[PDB]
From a paper:
The retromer complex (RC) controls the cellular localization and homeostasis of hundreds of transmembrane proteins, being involved in their recycling from early and maturing endosomes either to the trans-Golgi network (TGN) or back to the plasma membrane. The RC depends on transient association of the cargo-selective heterotrimer, formed by vacuolar protein sorting (VPS) 35, VPS26 and VPS29, with a few sorting nexins (Snx) components (Snx1 or 2 assembled with Snx5 or 6 forming a heterodimer). VPS35 (92 kDa) is the central protein component of the cargo selective trimer and is characterized by an elongated solenoid-like alpha helical structure that acts as a scaffold for the binding of VPS26 - at its N-terminal portion - and VPS29 at the C-terminal end. Since VPS26 and VPS29 do not interact with each other, the strategies to identify molecular chaperones to stabilize the complex are focused on the stabilization of either the VPS35/VPS29 or VPS35/VPS26 interfaces.
In this work we present the results of two X-ray diffraction experiments on crystals of the VPS35/VPS29 complex in presence of 2a. VPS35sh/VPS29 was co-crystallized with compound 2a in different conditions. The VPS35sh construct was chosen since the complex obtained with the longer C-terminal portion of the VPS35 protein (M475-Leu796) produced crystals that diffracted only at low resolution (∼7 Å, not shown). For both crystals, the Fo-Fc difference Fourier maps showed traces of additional electron density, where it was possible to model two 2a molecules. The more stable portion of 2a is in close contact with residues Gln72, Leu101-Leu102 and Gln105 from VPS29, and Glu722 and Arg726 from VPS35. Site2 is mainly located in a small superficial cleft of VPS35 between the extremities of four contiguous alpha helices. Such binding site seems to be incompatible with the stabilization of the VPS35/VPS29 interface, being mostly located on VPS35 and involving only transiently VPS29. Finally, we describe a novel binding site located in a deep cleft between VPS29 and VPS35 that should be further explored to select novel molecular chaperones for the stabilization of the retromer complex.
Numbering used by the authors:
A (entry chain A): 0 to 182
B (entry chain C): 491 to 517, 521 to 780
The structure:
Amino acid sequence: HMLVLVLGDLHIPHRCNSLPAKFKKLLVPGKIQHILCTGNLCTKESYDYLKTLAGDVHIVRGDFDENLNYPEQKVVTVGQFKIGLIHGHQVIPWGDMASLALLQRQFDVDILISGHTHKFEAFEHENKFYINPGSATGAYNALETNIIPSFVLMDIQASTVVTYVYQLIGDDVKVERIEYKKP
Amino acid sequence: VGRFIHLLRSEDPDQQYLILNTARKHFGNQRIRFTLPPLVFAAYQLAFRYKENSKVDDKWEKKCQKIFSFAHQTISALIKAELAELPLRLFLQGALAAGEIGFENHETVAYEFMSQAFSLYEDEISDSKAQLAAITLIIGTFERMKCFSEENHEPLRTQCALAASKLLKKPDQGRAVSTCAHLFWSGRNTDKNGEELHGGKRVMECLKKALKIANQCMDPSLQVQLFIEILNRYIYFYEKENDAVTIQVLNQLIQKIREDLPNLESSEETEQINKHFHNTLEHLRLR
Ligand SMILES: NC(N)=N/N=C/c1cccc(/C=N/N=C(N)N)c1
C-alpha cells in the first residue's frame, strides 16, 4: 500500500564516488512515494539524485553535510505510524539501543530511523520499532571493517510494516524481511 | 572531482600510498574544500589496510605513522584555507582511526588529533549552534575510544566537561554536561584492560550539575523539558546498573516535574513535553 525508501551515509565524495551500479539499477523513479534519508550525502548533488526517485523527500543533517539547511531531526506521520528520523551522531553512545530508546520517548514515535554506524539494524524493543538502513554506498567507518552497502524499503500497510533490507554481498543483492505490528 | 581517488584501489597498499601522494601533490585554495577530504578518508582507509597486513608487513607500523602525518598535514592545509568545522571533524575521525589501529605511538597520534580538534573548537567555532554541534561530536568520538591510558584520558575527560560547562546558553550547557556523563561510564581506558570506567559516582555529579544548570533557566517550558531529559538520563544509568542512581533521586525528580508541569502555558510544545513525561512514566511502570 505505501512504499518508503530509507537510506543514508552515502558520504559522496568524502568516502565514496557513487552508489553501486546494482543499487542504482534497483532504484528507479515512479516506484517509491516517500524517501526518508538519515543524511551524510554529503552534497546537493546527492539530494538532486534523491529528488529524481520521488517527490516526497525528507532529510536530516549528518555530521559531514555541507547543507546546514537540513533539520537535526524530523517526525513524519505515514498512515498509522509516527516515524522519527535522526542521523545518530547525537545519540551517545553511538548506536546504543538504550540511548535510541530515550529518543523514542522524546519524539513519541512508533518507529525510529537512525544512521551513523554504517550497519543495518531492524529490531523491536518494548513494542517499538528501530531501523538503521546502513550506508547505501558501503562507506568507510573507523569502528567497523566489514561494511556492506545497504538500504531499506518499508511497505506500510494499515497497522503493519514489512521492512525489506537490501544488501550488496559480492555482486549479489540479498534481501531480508522483518515485520512489525503496532501494539 | 576528488571522488576520483575512490575509484583507485590497488591490491598492494604500498602502491595505494604512492597513488595518494601523487594525488595530493596534484592538488588554488577554493577547490580544496571538496578535493582534499577524500584524500584524508582514503589515507585512513589505507592505514586499516596496513593493520590487516600486520602479520606479513614488517614495516606496517612505520607506514601507519607516515599515513597519519600525511593526513595531519592535509587537514592543516584546509585550516590555512580558513575552514574550521570540517577540519575539526577530520581530526576527530583521525583520532578515531589511530585509536583503533595499535601501531607504535598510536596513542600519541590519537591525542594530537584530539588536541587539534579542541584547538579549532576554542579558536574558530563562533556560533552557539555550531559549538554545541562540535562539542557533541567531540564527546561522542572520545566516548568510543579505548586507546588512552588514564593519564591521557583524564585531561580529555575534564576538557570535555570544561567546554560543556562554558557554552553560553544554559540549556546547551545542561545538555552537553549531561552527555559527558557517558565518558565517566562507558568510556574506556587501557588501565582497566579496555573495560568501561563505570565511574558511577562521577556520572551522578554530571547529572547533578546539569540539574543545577536547568534550575537556572528562566524559560519554564525549557526548564521542565531539561528536567525530563535528565530524568531519562538517570533512567538510562539505572538500567545499566549504576548503583549510585537511587530511587530517591528518580522519585524526587519525577515529583518536581509533576509540580511544575501544570504551570506551563497550554500549547502544542507543552503537549509534547507532557507526552515525553507520560512516555517516561509508562516505560518505568510497564517496561
Ligand atoms: N569548514 C566548513 N565546511 N565550513 N566553515 C568553516 C568556518 C570558517 C570560519 C568560521 C566558521 C564558523 N562558523 N560558524 C558557523 N556558525 N558557520 C566556520
